[PDB]
Amino acid sequence: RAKAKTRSSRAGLQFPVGRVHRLLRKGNYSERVGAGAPVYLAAVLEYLTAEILELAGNAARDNKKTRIIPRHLQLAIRNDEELNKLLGRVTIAQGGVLPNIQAVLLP
Amino acid sequence: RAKAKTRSSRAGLQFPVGRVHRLLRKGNYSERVGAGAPVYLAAVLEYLTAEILELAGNAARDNKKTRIIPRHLQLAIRNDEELNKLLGRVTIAQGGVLPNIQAVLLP
Amino acid sequence: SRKESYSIYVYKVLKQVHPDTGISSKAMGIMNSFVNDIFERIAGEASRLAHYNKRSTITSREIQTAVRLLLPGELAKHAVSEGTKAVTKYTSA
Amino acid sequence: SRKESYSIYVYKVLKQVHPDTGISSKAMGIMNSFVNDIFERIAGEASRLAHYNKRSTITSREIQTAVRLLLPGELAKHAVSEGTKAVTKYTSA
Amino acid sequence: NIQGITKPAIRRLARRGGVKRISGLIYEETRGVLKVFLENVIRDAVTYTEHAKRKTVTAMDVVYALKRQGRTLYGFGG
Amino acid sequence: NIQGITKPAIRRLARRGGVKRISGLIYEETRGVLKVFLENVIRDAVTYTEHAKRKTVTAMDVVYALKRQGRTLYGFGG
Amino acid sequence: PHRYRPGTVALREIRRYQKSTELLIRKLPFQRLVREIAQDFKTDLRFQSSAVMALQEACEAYLVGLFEDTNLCAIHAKRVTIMPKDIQLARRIRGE
Amino acid sequence: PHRYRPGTVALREIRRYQKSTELLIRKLPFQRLVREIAQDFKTDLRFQSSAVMALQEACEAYLVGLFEDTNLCAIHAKRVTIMPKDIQLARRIRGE
DNA sequence: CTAGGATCACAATCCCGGTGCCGAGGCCGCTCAATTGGTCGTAGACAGCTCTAGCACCGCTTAAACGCACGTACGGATTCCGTACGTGCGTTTAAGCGGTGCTAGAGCTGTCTACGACCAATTGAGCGGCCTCGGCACCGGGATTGTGATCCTAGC
DNA sequence: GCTAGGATCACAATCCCGGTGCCGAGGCCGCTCAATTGGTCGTAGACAGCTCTAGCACCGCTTAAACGCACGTACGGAATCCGTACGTGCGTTTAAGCGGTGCTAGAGCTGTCTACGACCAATTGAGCGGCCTCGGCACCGGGATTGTGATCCTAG
């Protein structure tokens, strides 16, 4: 037979298409799953992960740090209106809060 | 063969045990459905339906009406703290609101 | 084209609890929506409970637990009582 | 007992976007939770979409629509672009 | 057409909420809020329509949109 | 044990929330609110534990309980 | 010759509208608004009558709830008149 | 000798706690509270360390959010001190 | 001349008997999905074992909590003003209702093909276990910034 | 000589740097199990065609509601003063935290079995859409009642 080529590599993705497919079949969502659905889902997940990681790494570099910690994730998420909206009812563990003091309280 | 006896009649219920079962099997909830699950679900639904109709009929009679309208259903739901909690996010079409005026606004 | 509804069964329980009381069409639509909603909530919770425990079958236990999780306070107690009575009566035909 | 995760793939992506940046285990747990949550949301909405239209198959269209419904604003546009590109490349092997 | 939501209508809505006195600036704020809400709902309803390959928005599309936005509506088929 | 949530702790929590001045009656109210929240979460977590026929509440049970109340927690396995 | 003191008619209106259930926004204006808004998403869009009625039911319910919360906010400030700052506060707390 | 005017130390504390991320309630008292509360539902209940840690983490986040909304409520009434009425209003608006 | 009261005039309201309509609620046939009786296999129940991780206890060491005290500043009560909003009337407008006409498109049916489920044979992607060393947390001690007040001056 | 604005100062807290050392991030290893390949085949949905419904467009008529304006009053907002009670700080106390030790319960896994649900065929009756009709409701006029705003009266 032919040398095994992963479905991820065929789509140029880093996320596991085969694993996404298996999780769909065994997650009791529908009777059948199209061939393109796992590819699409994996690509979307990858894009979102890339975006968040990019913003967290940027926040880390501004802090002169070389490792991402929950704080940098909180900063990245809460400083982007769109990401904040997506993750509105989400609590990042060990994230803390954004520095915000009401103007009326200042001396 | 023997005369057809409905599963609803076996359970002493008015709700359709066979239809509750069919809806469960074709609703993509699980690969398998126990024999008692539809019976239990139907009984619970029936109980809730009995409760809300009793309270709505009581509200109608208090309003000198013989037919239940959406108003009576709003009255029943919002005047019961448990039912209100269960249906907290629900909007009843044509239901209106509960008469409530803040004490500070009174003459 | 037939559109299945719970209208008949709602009318039946209504005749049990209020023999002389009728129901408008609007209220009948409301009741159908209510029943469908509660169904979806309970069944979905049971599905999640099955998946979490690495089980396939939704049994009466999953339904009971879902009811306890969704119905507040005394509504759970009586709903559980009703379900248990019905299941018990049914298994003995 | 093995416990499948997204660790390898999220690390690969990080190494692609930030070759000289690492990640703590705690942050790794955060990322895993994030991925699982967003996978659930999108798949669940696709399933509901399929059911609404009396269809039994989840295709790329359901995923796309789910992505539009979930992701706010510009997030959706780019995600859709990424998904379409991936599907196109895959179909041409 | 947003001006069609006249001041008396907004007053009536406030009266149902048990509100006694109204500032002159409330009407414009309310109009804006309503516009935002309607935009969100119609965006979801149209998305649902597009998925079904329909060209007419049905009541079901609106009901579903409301449900997914945590504003479940009873009385229109679900 | 509810008294173990001391006045300084509540003050610290308020400080993280951006609070500058605190009334003396805030402490009893906060304790009550916290108790209610905790009761709700623990109730659901214990229900999950009992359904699994376990005698130890796991972190997953807590995560699920929080999730279903619309307070999804990241960092503890989902 | 007879003039009711400010507030009496307001309270009478409160009672009347809190007792009735019909829709309070004019149908045609609302329909026009809906169609105008939908136009930005797709052209030549048709609408079921029930779709418009559902939209109107949801919008009115939402607005009534918002006015209720706004009223509660106003009273907190020892006031009886609602202003935009009250709506903004209510919405902010609600998460909108 | 030197005495900072009321407010200075409060703002310094705000800055410090808003910059840090550690949990602010003492672990042991919280654990004892959790165990006391769970006792009313089921006896002889054991707790994973991570379960307690998750509960504490979540509770503190919830309370911080509530204090934030309470603070916003206070400012609305032209006050800088939070009182129970502010918490009550915040919770009411949130739907709790 | 007082405040509180009793009395009055009026509009808005709740109430009753009469009208009549269109919906609710029952009866028709029938069809399709709910029921009955059967075989088959695998998912879950039950018993046993392991070892992990939870519970319980003990001894120091501080860090933080508790308590008390002095004081300032912030909450709150009181007063006055003016303007913005409520109330009411006359005019205008466009919403609501009815009736007609049309056609686009929703909804349904029939055909057929693609393409998704399933299997057997294959194997390398991903897993847990092990090792390491450098990014980080902590420390000491300087430089830096900011708060609070003390002393000085130019101008009133 | 008194005052506002400023310069100058004390000193407390924070930011910064260089050194220390540790234990978590990250890579390597063996291997297994679940992802890939090639093939079979059944049915779900795409596509075409057809029908008939209901959504759109238009018109006329009535009248209820919106609008604009006039007037007045009561309410928001600004200002002032009091006082108490929360904040900052020093001293004493206490119990949280950490490290260590020991026990054991129960969570997780494995093996075996059986009973339970899936699936099928045969069949029959529940409940569906269509049809009919008569009484509960919405509406009306005339009335009795209530509440609001104003007035005259009383002992004081």
Domain extents for chain H?
Answer: 1-96
- Pairwise CA distance, residues C7 & C22, whole Å: 12
How close A15 gets to chain F, by Cα (Å)?
18
3-class secondary structure, D19: coil
Mark yes or no for CB contact H55/F62 under 8 Å: yes
- Pairwise CA distance, residues F6 & H21, whole Å: 20
Strand I nucleotides, any atom under 7 Å to a protein CB: 10-13, 23-26, 32-37, 43-45, 53-55, 64-66, 71-76, 84-88, 94-96, 104-108, 115-117, 122-128, 135-136, 147-149
Q: CA separation (Å) from E69 to B54, E64, G53? A: 31, 9, 18
What experimental approach yielded this model? cryo-EM
Query: Residue E78 CA to nucleotide J140 C1', Å?
Result: 38
3-class secondary structure, F57: strand
C33's tokens = 């929506």
- Pairwise CA distance, residues D83 & D73, whole Å: 16
Query: Burial code of B36-75, b = ≥16 C-beta within 10 A, e = fewer?
Result: bbbbbbbbbbbbbbbbbbbbbbbbbeeeeeeebbbbbbbb
Second-level CATH architecture of F2-68: Orthogonal Bundle (1.10)
Resolution (angstroms) stands at 3.4
Q: Measured between CB atoms, does B76 come within 8 Å of chain C?
A: no
Residue E22 has, within 13 A of its CA and on its CB side, a CA count of 24
A7's tokens = 């479905």
- Pairwise CA distance, residues H49 & H71, whole Å: 33
Query: For residue D13, which of G66, A41, A53 has the smallest C-alpha distance?
Result: A53
The pairing of strands B67-68 and A32-33 is unpaired
Query: For residue H7, which of A105, F17, F11 has the smallest C-alpha distance?
Result: A105
The total number of structural domains that make up chain B: 1
| Main-chain phi, psi angles of C57, to 5 degrees | -65, 130
- The answer to whether residues B82 and C74 touch, using CB atoms and an 8 Å cutoff, is yes
- Pairwise CA distance, residues G58 & E59, whole Å: 12
> What sections of C1-93 are H helices per DSSP?
7-17, 25-52, 60-70, 74-91
- Pairwise CA distance, residues A96 & A76, whole Å: 12
Mark yes or no for CB contact G83/E62 under 8 Å: no
Query: Burial code of G37-67, b = ≥16 C-beta within 10 A, e = fewer?
Result: bbeeeeeebebeebbbbbbbbbbbbbbbbbb
Mark yes or no for CB contact H64/A97 under 8 Å: yes
Query: For residue B54, which of B26, B25, B75 has the smallest C-alpha distance?
Result: B75
- Sorted by sequence, the CB contacts under 8 Å of residue H2 that are 6+ apart come out as none
- The answer to whether residues C13 and B50 touch, using CB atoms and an 8 Å cutoff, is yes
| Main-chain phi, psi angles of C21, to 5 degrees | -110, 130
Residues in chain H: 96
G45's tokens = 């869009």
State whether the Cα torsion G69-G72-G76-G82 is positive or negative: positive
- Pairwise CA distance, residues C61 & A30, whole Å: 24
B5's tokens = 């006896």
Touching subunits for chain A (3+ Cβ pairs under 8 A): B, C, D, F, H
- Pairwise CA distance, residues H9 & F72, whole Å: 34
- Pairwise CA distance, residues B49 & B47, whole Å: 5
CATH class of the domain comprising H1-96: mainly alpha
Mark yes or no for CB contact B23/C86 under 8 Å: no
Angle at A68 between CA D8 and CA H14, to 5 degrees: 145
- Pairwise CA distance, residues A94 & A92, whole Å: 6
Q: CA separation (Å) from G68 to C83, E13, E19, F46, H47? A: 39, 10, 7, 37, 43
Write out chain F residues lying below 8 Å of C69, CB-based. 44, 47, 68
Q: Is the CB of F4 under 7 A from strand J?
A: yes
- Sorted by sequence, the CB contacts under 8 Å of residue C14 that are 6+ apart come out as B53, B57, C21, C22, C23
- Pairwise CA distance, residues A84 & A78, whole Å: 5
- The answer to whether residues E70 and E50 touch, using CB atoms and an 8 Å cutoff, is no
Q: Which of H55, H62, H78, H86 is best to mutate for the F interface (most F CBs within 10 A)?
A: H55
Q: CA separation (Å) from C3 to B9, B80, C7, H66? A: 24, 32, 11, 47
Of D74, D87, D93, the CB nearest to A82: D74
Looking up tokens 């007053």 gives E11
Q: Report the CATH superfamily, name and number, of domain C2-93.
A: Histone, subunit A (1.10.20.10)
Residues in chain A: 107
Residue A29 has, within 13 A of its CA and on its CB side, a CA count of 29
DSSP one-letter code for E4: G
> What sections of chain H are H helices per DSSP?
8-19, 27-39, 49-76, 84-94
- Pairwise CA distance, residues E70 & F7, whole Å: 37
- Pairwise CA distance, residues G34 & G52, whole Å: 8
Amino acid of residue A88: G
Query: Burial code of F31-65, b = ≥16 C-beta within 10 A, e = fewer?
Result: bebbeebbeebbbbbbbbbbbbeeeebbbbbbbbb
Looking up tokens 């005394």 gives C74
Residue H67 has, within 13 A of its CA and on its CB side, a CA count of 30
Give strand ranges (E) for A1-107.
Answer: 32-33, 67-68, 90-92
Query: For residue A7, which of A18, A23, A20, A22 has the smallest C-alpha distance?
Result: A18
3-class secondary structure, F73: strand
The 10 Å Cβ neighbour count of residue H50 is 16
Q: Which residue of chain B is at minimal alpha-carbon distance from D52?
A: B27
3-class secondary structure, F71: coil
- Sorted by sequence, the CB contacts under 8 Å of residue A72 that are 6+ apart come out as A56, A57, A59, A60, A63, A65, D27
CATH number at residue B91: 1.10.20.10
- The answer to whether residues G77 and H76 touch, using CB atoms and an 8 Å cutoff, is yes
Q: Is the CB of B105 under 7 A from strand J?
A: no
- Pairwise CA distance, residues A88 & A90, whole Å: 6
D55's tokens = 């269809």
- The answer to whether residues B76 and B98 touch, using CB atoms and an 8 Å cutoff, is no
The 10 Å Cβ neighbour count of residue G26 is 15
Evaluate whether residue A89 is within a structural domain.
Answer: yes
Amino acid of residue H72: L
Q: Which residue of chain C is at minimal alpha-carbon distance from E78?
A: C33
G48's tokens = 């079921």
Query: For residue D38, which of A77, G39, B53 has the smallest C-alpha distance?
Result: A77
Q: CA separation (Å) from A104 to C32, F20, G93, H79? A: 52, 11, 18, 10
- Sorted by sequence, the CB contacts under 8 Å of residue H95 that are 6+ apart come out as B88
Q: Measured between CB atoms, does B100 come within 8 Å of chain D?
A: no
Mark yes or no for CB contact E52/D65 under 8 Å: no
Q: CA separation (Å) from H40 to D38, F35, H34? A: 36, 13, 11
Query: For residue C29, which of E66, B27, E60 has the smallest C-alpha distance?
Result: E60
Query: For residue E59, which of A39, G56, C64, F25 has the smallest C-alpha distance?
Result: G56
State whether the Cα torsion D51-D52-D57-D63 is positive or negative: negative
Looking up tokens 């534990």 gives F49
- Pairwise CA distance, residues G49 & G53, whole Å: 6
G52's tokens = 């418009």
Chain mean position to CA B11: 19
Evaluate whether residue B72 is within a structural domain.
Answer: yes
What is the widest separation between alpha-carbon atoms in chain D? Answer: 50
Query: For residue C92, which of B16, B46, B36 has the smallest C-alpha distance?
Result: B36
Evaluate whether residue B1 is within a structural domain.
Answer: no
Mark yes or no for CB contact B100/G11 under 8 Å: no
> What sections of B1-107 are H helices per DSSP?
7-11, 17-25, 36-62, 70-78, 81-86
**Domain of residue A11, residue span:** 6-107
Contacts 24+ apart (CB under 8 A), D64-69: D64/A40, D65/E47, D65/E50, D65/E51, D66/D41, D66/D42, D67/A44, D67/D42, D68/E47, D69/D45, D69/E44, D69/E47, D69/E68
Amino acid of residue A71: R
Strand partners, D22: A67
- The answer to whether residues G21 and B70 touch, using CB atoms and an 8 Å cutoff, is yes
Query: Residue B32 CA to nucleotide I40 C1', Å?
Result: 16
Query: Residue F45 CA to nucleotide J128 C1', Å?
Result: 45
